[PDB]
Enzyme design. Structure first.
Site, PDB file in Angstrom:
ATOM      1  N   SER A 202       0.856  -1.180   0.000  1.00  0.00           N
ATOM      2  CA  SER A 202       0.000   0.000   0.000  1.00  0.00           C
ATOM      3  C   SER A 202       0.893   1.231   0.000  1.00  0.00           C
ATOM      4  O   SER A 202       1.730   1.392   0.893  1.00  0.00           O
ATOM      5  CB  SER A 202      -0.934   0.011   1.209  1.00  0.00           C
ATOM      6  OG  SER A 202      -1.787   1.140   1.181  1.00  0.00           O
ATOM      7  N   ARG A 203       0.715   2.096  -0.999  1.00  0.00           N
ATOM      8  CA  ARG A 203       1.588   3.257  -1.129  1.00  0.00           C
ATOM      9  C   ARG A 203       1.251   4.350  -0.124  1.00  0.00           C
ATOM     10  O   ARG A 203       2.150   5.075   0.316  1.00  0.00           O
ATOM     11  CB  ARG A 203       1.523   3.806  -2.552  1.00  0.00           C
ATOM     12  CG  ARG A 203       2.528   3.162  -3.487  1.00  0.00           C
ATOM     13  CD  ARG A 203       2.186   3.412  -4.941  1.00  0.00           C
ATOM     14  NE  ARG A 203       3.335   3.171  -5.806  1.00  0.00           N
ATOM     15  CZ  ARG A 203       4.349   4.011  -5.954  1.00  0.00           C
ATOM     16  NH1 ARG A 203       4.382   5.173  -5.324  1.00  0.00           N
ATOM     17  NH2 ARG A 203       5.357   3.676  -6.754  1.00  0.00           N
ATOM     18  N   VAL A 204      -0.024   4.495   0.240  1.00  0.00           N
ATOM     19  CA  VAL A 204      -0.395   5.478   1.254  1.00  0.00           C
ATOM     20  C   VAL A 204       0.214   5.106   2.599  1.00  0.00           C
ATOM     21  O   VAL A 204       0.753   5.961   3.313  1.00  0.00           O
ATOM     22  CB  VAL A 204      -1.927   5.611   1.332  1.00  0.00           C
ATOM     23  CG1 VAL A 204      -2.336   6.337   2.598  1.00  0.00           C
ATOM     24  CG2 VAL A 204      -2.446   6.343   0.113  1.00  0.00           C
TER      25      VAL A 204
END
Ligand SMILES: Nc1ncnc2c1ncn2[C@@H]1O[C@H](COP(=O)(O)OP(=O)(O)OP(=O)(O)O)[C@@H](O)[C@H]1O
Ligand SMILES: [Mg+2]
Lengths: 489, 48, 463
Positions: free
Chosen positions: A351-353
């Protein structure tokens, strides 16, 4: 007369018209028998148009007329709890929808100056994805796996888990058997999640044009709450079938071919759709509503689903859509058969967030689980040779085994924030070091059910606030000690 | 015990090297494979 | 004089002109009454031109008039573009008002000729110890950034942007080819918060935009950088300029999509027939002329982890240095996180840089490789059980690894420690002294985030 033409060729659901000189790209057209069509090819002396309905009633020589408007759908809060076709016509038989306003289907995403950082959490009820792959309001997370690997289940659980959140939900089904859609709607209505959900359906027997235009109409219906300051969530069950329908239409329209016969403008197709899931700023909401709403920010979250053949993630469309989203959830076929029911692969899911989309307590408590899972991945072949290791590595392996068995969960049972927090706190501390490896699942539920019956005030406080102060920790520890002392599992 | 070490070590090393060469072959085939279909598809575009 | 649309199929648009006044290749047209622009791409018979629109074709009909600019897409160039965000056509998208610059330049231009090349190869000083010592840059060179997310890629970009202006009194241009909107907003706000926005000009081509926009977005940044290079201050001397490419793989992908849309026979691995030529068009205008220099830093993504793939194969023919960011080092706590063994430079030869620099760099690389070979023996066979020379190599390798890290200037408002720019000579002297063995008693903890060598001595004696 520039607003009337004739039909000169009917084939495979595509009609070629001669006339309509002032006809725009994407404008709707009216066929003789109350039928509608969409223009997509404006050649020198003909107009290519697809039919949104049954083309078997169209014959050469019939008339047509241009509407003067682009494709539109009815939008509002009166569509909650209803099942509709891709154009807004109800199919559940419960009566007409009292629509108040309509919106265009093809729209452009807000600019880069109107965006906002993603810092608010969205829950799905699964511990594995809630602690390892956080999803925030305005994010774009993709679920990718082979057939019968658990993809729809997770989407429906995510929709269900918004009972006490105030987030609206839209569910789009493309190219599915009608019995499956009926079963899904029946299960949604049984639980009670249909009071805030809209369903758009395009069955396998429907024309390819409807299966291609359904996700855009679903996104347009989901954008209503973003512009007005109230959050929303949208799920596309299969973008692969939309891609297949688009390929069929393009090939039947003679557009130039490419790898796997896909047309040139296929990356743009999903790019212009997935980029509309964004979190706007307070200024955008203030300007759109002309001062009606102040100090509120909207959002829109997307959960597309993709199926791969034999695990070939290097195919054209999976690679096209992986590079667009902000993360990936990978479901394995071997893990499903091995007994890991959620079947989420940790190690290739990202997950980039990240941790910016979590509450305080979850953000504090996720690190122990992440570290334990990483250390279990590091040393796992030593399971047979456990006695030959030193004490530290053996303890690490045992803790990893307990943690990886804690992640297993049943369908139609979303966990709450308090439930996840209690389970993770019991695991991060040494409480689950005495129970047997095979009995962890039974111990976890019993502990959850002991709470919500003796400590409900505390559960309500955790659910409503999400704070983490020394006082909460003391209450959780005391409750866990009391359960371990008195009750039995 | 020591002997086993060496033997086992060798195996691991060999395995590693093996993987590398297979990867190369795979990539080749991959690229090659794609080209073929494109040609065939282009042939269809000339079939009319 | 005026034209009209005769065919609309997706993005490709066919326009018909008079028998004589037929616009040339790459000319820019504008449809009256609409905010739509078209770019000439191919010339056909009967005065028919096949073009690609920059924008969307929804709400467009056959028979609309078109006016010809008789020139390529011209963008405003000057000092009034410092600190603004514009799209491909050079229009503000920050709601900050029009750009006061009135002078414009075309984005299509030939590369400098054979006789305009520099008479020598001169190094560029950045201030970062590891980059200067093991991957030296060259004025007019090209650097490929191989790294993922979460390894500090943007922080390094901002640090270089600050360092060039502080040292060489240069400017920078940033071009984003097919970037996500969320990350673009985050990057803009980070630049504003770190106070580096004043020295940079930014051009964005969004992912949701048609491929025509993403293909022609690098040329605008190139034109702006070229204008910055040739500005003559009193006594001439031009200026040194940096250019940034957020990802060059998406440039090739946009070219492929445009070629497929126009319609032509695909090449091998589905690439367009004109791939190397299209990339050489971009990479041959980035060079060091007599007036001044342009250096480009580009991010490269390898598709399917295949170095033999045609796109990386074409890319690697123009790269002079490769900087590799590793997640392993970042976890270890050593930022900036640049791998000192997988990073290579063509300028690390005894001729361009000298003899002592080459010797020191090779010795450091040899020591690091020796340490990499020895860790496994310690891990499995056991600790110690080894001669002294290996142990000395291990200790020196650990000291060097600590010494590679340094604080930055763009993080002063976060940590509070001032940034350190170390002149090359100091790095050379410190590394030569460390390799000699003088600092065999200094604790290694004095080598961490300590900048120059004397500063190491001061921190050691203070402790
Ligand atoms: N968490 C779970 N625990 C146990 N069984 C599960 C779980 N999730 C799904 N299942 C079951 O496993 C099967 C997977 O069906 P599901 O609809 O989730 O798969 P799918 O990926 O959507 O498949 P399809 O490609 O056929 O649409 C079903 O029988 C479902 O009831
Ligand atoms: Mg399924």
């Amino acid at each position: 007369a520039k607003n009337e033409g004739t039909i000169v060729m009917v084939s495979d659901g595509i009609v070629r018209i001669h006339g309509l000189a002032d006809a725009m790209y994407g404008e709707m057209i009216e066929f003789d028998g109350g039928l509608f069509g969409m223009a997509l090819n404006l050649e020198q002396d003909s107009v290519g148009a697809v039919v949104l309905g049954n083309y078997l009633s169209l014959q050469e020589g019939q008339k047509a007329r241009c509407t003067g408007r682009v494709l539109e759908v009815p939008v509002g809060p009166e569509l909650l709890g209803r099942v509709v076709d891709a154009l807004g016509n109800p199919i559940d038989g419960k009566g007409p929808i009292d629509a108040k306003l309509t919106d265009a289907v093809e729209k452009v995403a807000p600019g880069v100056i109107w965006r906002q950082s993603v810092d608010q959490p969205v829950q799905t009820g699964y511990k594995s994805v809630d602690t390892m792959i956080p999803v925030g309001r305005g994010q774009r997370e993709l679920i990718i796996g082979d057939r019968q690997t658990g993809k729809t289940a997770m989407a429906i659980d995510a929709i269900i888990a918004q009972k006490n959140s105030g987030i609206k939900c839209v569910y789009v089904a493309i190219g599915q058997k009608q019995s499956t859609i009926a079963n899904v709607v029946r299960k949604l209505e049984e639980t009670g999640a249909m009071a805030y959900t809209t369903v758009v359906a395009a069955a396998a027997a429907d024309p390819a044009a409807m299966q291609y235009l359904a996700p855009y109409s679903g996104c347009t219906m989901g954008e209503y709450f973003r512009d007005r300051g109230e959050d929303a969530l949208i799920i596309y069950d299969d973008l692969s079938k939309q891609a297949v329908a688009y390929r069929q239409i393009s090939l039947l329209l003679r557009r130039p071919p490419g790898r796997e016969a896909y047309p040139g403008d296929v990356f743009y197709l999903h790019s212009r759709l997935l980029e509309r899931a964004s979190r706007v700023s307070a200024e955008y909401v203030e300007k759109f509503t002309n001062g009606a709403v102040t100090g509120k920010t909207g959002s829109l979250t997307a959960l597309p689903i993709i199926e791969t053949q034999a695990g070939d993630v290097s195919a054209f469309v999976p690679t096209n859509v992986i590079s667009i989203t902000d993360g990936q959830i990978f479901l394995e076929t071997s893990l499903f058969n091995a007994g890991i029911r959620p079947a989420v692969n940790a190690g290739i899911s990202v997950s980039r967030v990240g941790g910016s989309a979590q509450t305080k307590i979850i953000k504090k408590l996720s690190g122990g689980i992440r570290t334990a899972l990483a250390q279990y991945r590091e040393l796992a072949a030593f399971a047979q040779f456990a006695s030959d290791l030193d004490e530290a590595t053996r303890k690490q392996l045992e803790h990893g085994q307990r943690v990886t068995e804690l992640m297993k969960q049943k369908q139609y049972a979303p966990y709450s924030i308090a439930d996840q927090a209690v389970s993770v706190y019991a695991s991060n501390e040494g409480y689950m070091a005495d129970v047997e490896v095979k009995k962890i699942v039974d111990f976890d539920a019993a502990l959850i059910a002991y709470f919500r019956s003796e400590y409900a005030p505390l559960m309500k406080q955790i659910d409503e606030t999400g704070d983490y102060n020394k006082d909460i920790e003391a209450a959780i520890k005391a409750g866990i000690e009391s359960f371990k002392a008195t009750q039995t599992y | 015990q020591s002997a086993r070490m060496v033997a086992m070590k060798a195996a691991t090393d060999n395995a590693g090297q093996l993987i590398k060469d297979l990867q190369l072959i795979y990539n080749k085939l991959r690229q090659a494979a794609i080209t073929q279909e494109i040609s065939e598809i282009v042939g269809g575009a000339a079939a009319v | 004089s005026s034209g009209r649309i005769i065919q609309i199929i997706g993005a490709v648009i066919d326009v018909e002109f008079e028998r004589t006044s037929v616009p040339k290749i790459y000319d820019a047209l504008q449809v009256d009454g609409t905010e739509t622009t078209l770019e000439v791409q191919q010339q056909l018979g009967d005065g028919v031109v096949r073009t690609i629109a920059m924008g969307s074709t929804e709400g467009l009909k056959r028979g609309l008039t078109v006016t010809s600019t008789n020139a390529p897409i011209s963008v405003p160039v000057g000092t009034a573009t410092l600190g603004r965000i514009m799209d491909v056509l050079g229009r503000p998208i920050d709601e900050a008002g029009p750009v006061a610059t009135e002078e414009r330049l075309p984005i299509h231009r030939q590369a400098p000729s054979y006789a305009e090349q520099a008479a020598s190869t001169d190094l560029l000083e950045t201030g970062i110890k590891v980059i200067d010592l093991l991957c030296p840059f060259a004025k007019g060179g090209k650097v490929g950034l191989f790294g993922g997310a979460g390894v500090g890629k943007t922080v390094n970009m901002m640090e270089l942007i600050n360092n060039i202006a502080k040292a060489h009194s240069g400017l920078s241009v940033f071009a984003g080819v097919g970037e996500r909107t969320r990350e673009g907003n985050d990057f803009y706000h980070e630049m504003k918060d770190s106070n580096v926005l004043d020295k940079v000009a930014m051009v964005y081509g969004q992912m949701n935009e048609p491929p025509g926009n993403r293909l022609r977005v690098a040329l605008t940044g190139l034109t702006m950088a070229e204008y910055f290079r040739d500005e003559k201050d009193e006594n001439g001397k031009g200026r040194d300029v940096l250019l940034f490419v957020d990802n060059i793989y998406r440039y090739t992908l946009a070219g492929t999509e445009v070629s497929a849309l126009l319609g032509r026979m695909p090449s091998a691995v589905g690439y367009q027939p004109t791939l190397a030529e299209e990339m050489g068009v971009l990479q041959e205008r980035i060079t060091s002329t007599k007036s001044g220099s342009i250096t480009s830093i580009q991010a490269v993504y390898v598709p399917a982890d295949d170095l033999t793939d045609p796109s990386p194969a074409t890319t690697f023919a123009h790269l002079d240095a490769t900087v590799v960011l590793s997640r392993d080092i970042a976890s270890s706590g050593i930022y900036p996180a640049i791998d000192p063994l997988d990073s290579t430079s063509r300028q690390l030869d005894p001729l361009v840089v000298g003899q002592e620099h080459y010797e020191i760099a090779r010795a450091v690389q040899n020591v690091l490789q020796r340490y990499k070979e020895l860790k496994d023996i310690i891990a499995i066979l056991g600790m110690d059980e080894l001669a002294e020379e290996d142990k000395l190599v291990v200790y020196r390798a650990r000291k060097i690894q600590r010494f590679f890290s340094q604080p930055f200037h763009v993080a002063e408002v976060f940590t509070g420690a001032p940034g350190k720019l170390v002149p090359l000579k100091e790095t050379i002297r410190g590394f030569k002294g460390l390799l000699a063995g003088e600092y065999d008693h200094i604790p290694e903890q004095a080598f961490y985030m300590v900048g120059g060598i004397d500063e190491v001595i001061a921190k050691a004696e203070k402790l």
